[PDB]
Amino acid sequence: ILGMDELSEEDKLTVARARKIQRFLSQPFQVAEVFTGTPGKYVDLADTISGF
Amino acid sequence: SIAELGIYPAVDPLDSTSRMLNPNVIGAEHYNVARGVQKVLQDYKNLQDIIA
Amino acid sequence: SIAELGIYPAVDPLDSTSRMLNPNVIGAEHYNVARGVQKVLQDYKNLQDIIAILGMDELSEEDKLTVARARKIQRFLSQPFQVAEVFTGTPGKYVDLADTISGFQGVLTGKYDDLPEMAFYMVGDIKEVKEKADKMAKDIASRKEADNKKVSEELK
Amino acid sequence: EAAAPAGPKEFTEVWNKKAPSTLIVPEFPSNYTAVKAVGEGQVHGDAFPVNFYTPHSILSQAQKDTVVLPGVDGYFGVKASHVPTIAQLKPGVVELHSGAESEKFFVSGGFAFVHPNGVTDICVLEAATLDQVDPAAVKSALAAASAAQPTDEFEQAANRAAIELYSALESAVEAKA
Amino acid sequence: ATDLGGLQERITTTTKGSITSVQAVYVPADDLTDPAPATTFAHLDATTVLSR
Amino acid sequence: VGLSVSRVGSAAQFPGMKQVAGTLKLELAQYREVAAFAQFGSDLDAATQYVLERGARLTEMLKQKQFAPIPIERQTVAVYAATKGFLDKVRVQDIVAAEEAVISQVNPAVFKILKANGKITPALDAHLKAELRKVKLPGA
Amino acid sequence: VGLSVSRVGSAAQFPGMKQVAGTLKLELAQYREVAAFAQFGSDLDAATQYVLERGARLTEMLKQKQFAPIPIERQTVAVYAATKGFLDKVRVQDIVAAEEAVISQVNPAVFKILKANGKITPALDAHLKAELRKVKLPGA
Amino acid sequence: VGLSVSRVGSAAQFPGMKQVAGTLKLELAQYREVAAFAQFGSDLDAATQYVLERGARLTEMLKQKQFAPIPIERQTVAVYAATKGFLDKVRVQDIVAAEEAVISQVNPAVFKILKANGKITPALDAHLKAELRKVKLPGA
Amino acid sequence: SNQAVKQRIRAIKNIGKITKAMKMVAASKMKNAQIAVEQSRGLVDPFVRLFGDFPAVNSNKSVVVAVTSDKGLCGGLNSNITKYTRATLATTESEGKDVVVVSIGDKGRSQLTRIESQRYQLAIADTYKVRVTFGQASLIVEELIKHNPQSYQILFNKFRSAISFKPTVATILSPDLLEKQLEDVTGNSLDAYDIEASHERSDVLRDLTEFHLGVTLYNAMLENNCSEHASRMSAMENSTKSAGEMLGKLTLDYNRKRQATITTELIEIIAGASALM
């Protein structure tokens, strides 16, 4: 309703970190590689805690 | 709701149907008047949540 | 809901009735004061939706006078009970019938549009609303100097 | 002569002793301006603060060293520590120099104050700059302004204002660099 | 409650292994206090909401 | 007054009360519908506002203390005094004393022929047209 | 706290807690009155604005972790440390760490007198006010 | 259109309809979101008014008359003429006739190759952009 | 009973759309009226440094102006400066002066005659319908100088931000009727300026006070218009929030009544079957 540059720069960083969190929650699946080509990735728990 | 506006007969225009409302049966210049009346009254019923 | 508003005894004034509420039984001014209080409360109950969804700031002036008098007489109908003074801390307040009629006639005519709302909350009668008004408007002026210690190293 | 010290300092007194306490003392337009007129300084040498104003725009807040203003008694020029002057301006061009470069706006007429601290305030209504005026519809308008002499003094004054604006807009559109 | 409990109480971790059940939950009339989800939710330990 | 119906209609009504009742119904029907906007008393509209305070006169007219039924002649005179505009000067909150002043201050020979004649005759609607003005109404 | 009632434990509370948490539930009442109307961001009356971040301190003082019960003497000192303003101007995201600072630094002989008398005696609140001033609150 | 679901229609419709219907159902997903909002048409943003006008174009485009079902290639080119350009100037009152005009005046050999190929090939796409500009629309 | 709740739910669910719509509409109006307001803020400064700011003058005739809104869904903005104009009319009136009250906005004529009926003499409205210009503000100013007062008081809400609207009172004095008298400081404070007018100082001060009244009226009713939009955007966002909360409680109660309905008719069917079988 107001605009992207309406809010602060720490709000810009909240937007940026949340947009790269929203993409980092995505994952290619090993069962869906037959019709999407790219191989799927089983991410361990010790890796996703550290990554986030 | 038609009746406590004092309108008699209190026939709901947007609930009364007939199988004689084909353009094949009563002709097009009657059916277009009836459909326009129902369209106008339904849009007024939509606008009554603002204009009240 | 009246109990959740803090008003105790949580009597709904627009749902409690009596066969003694009759001008030939209790008198004329008692019955008229009772009907006036119920008219103010009903007129406030009819304003609850627009006060909820539009805000208090969009009524008429007589409407927002009605809202203020009704919020006064809602608090004034509450009372501290002498059997509740063990779990409340307030002393109980037996109000005489003439005191109730006189106080509610005072709020109805408009003699008390000047007091706050919480002056009426949990008091006996129309003297104690003024006592509580000066008790709560000396409280916003209640700021004393030097903290009055006399505790720093009390000798033996 | 000075027997009524009015002001926002003293309105607070008579208001606080006579208005209900739920309202704080209302604000005043002097609380929003930082630059006064009789106060010390704001010249520092050559460039003085010029404030060019219209109701719908602010055209200059920058410091200029000379301003050429079109007063009703002729185009005058405002240097740094110029004498304080409330000058009514006729239709003419306002030139705000800073050096080699200058901004030339043709204005519509309206006052221009120079203050005892060197603050200059040009206050016009419509400041239509010279590269957005057309040179064709000026003659189409001053033709009717030359021709029409009505019976009433009101449209007479309007036509005299018309010709003194359009004639000045003639002289500052052919002789431009 | 007893039929749902007799189903869902066999899905536990024993000493020998575990069953972990992923159950699709339909909510009747979009009412979370309806007795079928309100009895089903007493057994669930996690919810995985797939949104459009 | 909206949901109250009588399917005998006005066929079983006292005449004269019928002469005021269609008007009273019609102004109450207007007062009901231009309400649900009467909370915004700010904007005076002067066509709806007359309807609102006129319907307020009529709604305050039909209030009645119990255990005292009114004779029908005094009822139709009290409604005629509100549907012809005699009470437009008095405020909303003080008509139940104004109607009692009207009933007790007109001549009691108005009712003795309104009951007998059955309807408001032309030899009577201008008698009480002047009788309703020679009384004092408690309100300015 | 508004709905949670117990009309049977009043004559059944710790007398040291009964005199310090009579102040706690009333100040939480005003915090329930301010934040239920002043959520709009209309104005700060600067006295209702005081009881908003006082009641926010009493709320954060009343948080508790799981499977860690507190003795009643180490409770009524943390309620004493907060309603008497010793925990004032500590930032509201410090009070979990600050009421742990209160119990850790106050001399453990304080809690032994308070458990045995069951009551904050006049000889003790003068002493317990002293031991709360010697408290390294976080953040200063 | 928001409440009617088909859990098969992913890869079970006409491919020429699938080229266009994704855009048609995503343009209507914005119109149903902003429609009951901007019932008034007075003070509007230049992005919300555009999807309002597009949704009002598609809504009058989808309605059809009784006992006259349309072949699939003709409704394919009608939704192609609606969700692309070619109809952003007829108001709302004429789209009922404008889709009939774009059905009848278009060289009907595009329907035969649309029906036989099944989809909108880029050659037929370019002839369909070219064939849709020379249609005399009855917007007047 | 169980159907009227389903219509009340749809009504509140539609109010929660209408108020969200006009919250966005008021936001779009506020973001482009703020642009005009902070450009209009410039021209008021040379007059308040040239003529000073004297609110507490001994005018014997005053014109107060309460600059209100036209649309009345603003949230306590118009009655705020009604309180302020009855506070400033109870600040200057202590000496037996004539006061004319005018108002800009229909919410001014509906809230000023309730507090004061006799001094109110003029109602300007329909100002913000198309836009607010300086020719319009100057026409309003000329209709204000149809009276001949010694002072003018403007009351308006100044757009400090989208949250704060400080009610500003703005004062203008008649030229040598009161302006030359209030400047006499053992001499004059205006004698430092060299008048470059075509006529004498009284005529240039008359023209200057008319121009000052015009620019403060234009800035006053720009600031009040965009602060009206900001208070409507904030007042329809406390409105759609409450209409979402009321809708949530209505949906919960409707679901309770729905479940109780199904159990009630089921129990009656079971009782009627067991009364036979």
Coordinates of C-alpha atoms in Angstrom, one line a residue, chain D residues 12-136:
Chain D
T12 CA 0.7 29.9 26.1
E13 CA 0.0 31.9 29.4
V14 CA -3.5 33.1 28.6
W15 CA -4.3 29.8 27.0
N16 CA -3.1 27.7 29.9
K17 CA -5.1 29.8 32.4
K18 CA -8.3 29.6 30.3
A19 CA -8.3 26.3 28.2
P20 CA -9.1 22.8 29.5
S21 CA -6.0 20.8 30.5
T22 CA -6.6 17.8 28.2
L23 CA -5.3 20.0 25.3
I24 CA -1.7 21.0 25.1
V25 CA -1.0 24.5 23.7
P26 CA -1.5 24.5 19.9
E27 CA 1.4 24.9 17.7
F28 CA 2.2 28.0 15.6
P29 CA 3.9 28.5 12.2
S30 CA 6.9 30.2 13.9
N31 CA 7.8 26.9 15.5
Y32 CA 8.4 25.4 12.1
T33 CA 10.8 28.0 10.7
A34 CA 14.4 28.2 11.7
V35 CA 15.5 31.3 9.9
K36 CA 14.3 34.7 11.2
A37 CA 14.9 38.2 9.8
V38 CA 16.5 40.4 12.4
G39 CA 18.9 37.8 13.9
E40 CA 22.6 37.5 13.6
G41 CA 24.6 36.3 10.7
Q42 CA 23.6 34.2 7.6
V43 CA 25.6 36.3 5.1
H44 CA 29.2 35.2 5.5
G45 CA 30.8 37.2 2.7
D46 CA 29.5 37.0 -0.8
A47 CA 26.7 34.4 -1.1
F48 CA 23.5 35.0 0.8
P49 CA 20.5 32.6 1.3
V50 CA 17.9 33.0 -1.5
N51 CA 14.5 31.3 -1.1
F52 CA 12.5 31.2 -4.3
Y53 CA 8.9 30.3 -3.6
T54 CA 5.6 29.7 -5.4
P55 CA 2.5 28.1 -3.6
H56 CA 2.9 24.9 -5.7
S57 CA 6.7 24.7 -5.8
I58 CA 10.0 25.5 -4.1
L59 CA 12.4 26.5 -6.9
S60 CA 15.5 27.6 -5.0
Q61 CA 16.8 27.1 -1.5
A62 CA 20.5 27.4 -2.5
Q63 CA 22.8 30.2 -1.6
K64 CA 23.3 32.7 -4.4
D65 CA 25.6 35.7 -4.6
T66 CA 23.4 38.1 -6.6
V67 CA 19.7 38.1 -7.6
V68 CA 18.2 40.3 -10.4
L69 CA 14.5 41.0 -9.4
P70 CA 12.0 42.8 -11.6
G71 CA 10.5 45.4 -9.3
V72 CA 7.6 47.8 -10.2
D73 CA 10.2 50.6 -10.4
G74 CA 12.6 48.5 -12.6
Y75 CA 14.9 45.5 -12.5
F76 CA 17.1 45.9 -9.4
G77 CA 19.9 43.7 -8.2
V78 CA 20.4 42.2 -4.8
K79 CA 24.1 41.9 -3.7
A80 CA 25.2 40.3 -0.4
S81 CA 24.6 42.8 2.4
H82 CA 21.8 44.6 0.5
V83 CA 19.6 47.1 2.3
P84 CA 16.4 45.5 3.7
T85 CA 13.7 45.9 1.1
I86 CA 10.1 44.8 0.7
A87 CA 9.9 45.0 -3.1
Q88 CA 6.7 44.6 -5.1
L89 CA 7.6 42.9 -8.4
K90 CA 5.9 43.4 -11.7
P91 CA 5.9 40.7 -14.4
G92 CA 9.6 40.1 -15.3
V93 CA 12.5 37.7 -15.2
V94 CA 14.3 36.6 -12.0
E95 CA 18.0 35.8 -12.4
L96 CA 19.6 33.9 -9.6
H97 CA 23.4 34.0 -10.3
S98 CA 26.0 32.0 -8.5
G99 CA 29.0 32.6 -10.8
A100 CA 29.1 31.7 -14.5
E101 CA 25.8 29.9 -14.2
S102 CA 22.4 31.5 -13.4
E103 CA 18.8 30.4 -13.4
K104 CA 16.4 32.7 -15.3
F105 CA 12.7 32.3 -14.4
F106 CA 10.0 34.5 -15.8
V107 CA 7.6 35.1 -12.9
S108 CA 4.1 36.5 -12.8
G109 CA 4.4 39.2 -10.1
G110 CA 4.6 39.0 -6.4
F111 CA 6.8 40.4 -3.6
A112 CA 10.4 39.8 -2.8
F113 CA 11.8 40.6 0.7
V114 CA 15.4 41.2 1.7
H115 CA 15.9 40.8 5.5
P116 CA 18.4 42.4 7.9
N117 CA 20.3 39.1 8.1
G118 CA 20.8 39.0 4.4
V119 CA 18.1 36.4 3.8
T120 CA 16.3 37.1 0.5
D121 CA 12.8 35.7 -0.1
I122 CA 11.4 35.8 -3.6
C123 CA 7.6 35.0 -3.3
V124 CA 5.9 34.9 -6.7
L125 CA 2.7 33.0 -7.8
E126 CA 3.6 31.4 -11.2
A127 CA 7.2 31.2 -12.1
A128 CA 7.1 30.0 -15.7
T129 CA 10.7 29.7 -16.9
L130 CA 11.7 30.9 -20.3
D131 CA 12.3 27.6 -22.1
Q132 CA 8.7 26.5 -21.5
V133 CA 6.9 29.6 -22.7
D134 CA 5.6 29.6 -26.3
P135 CA 6.5 32.6 -28.4
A136 CA 3.4 32.3 -30.6

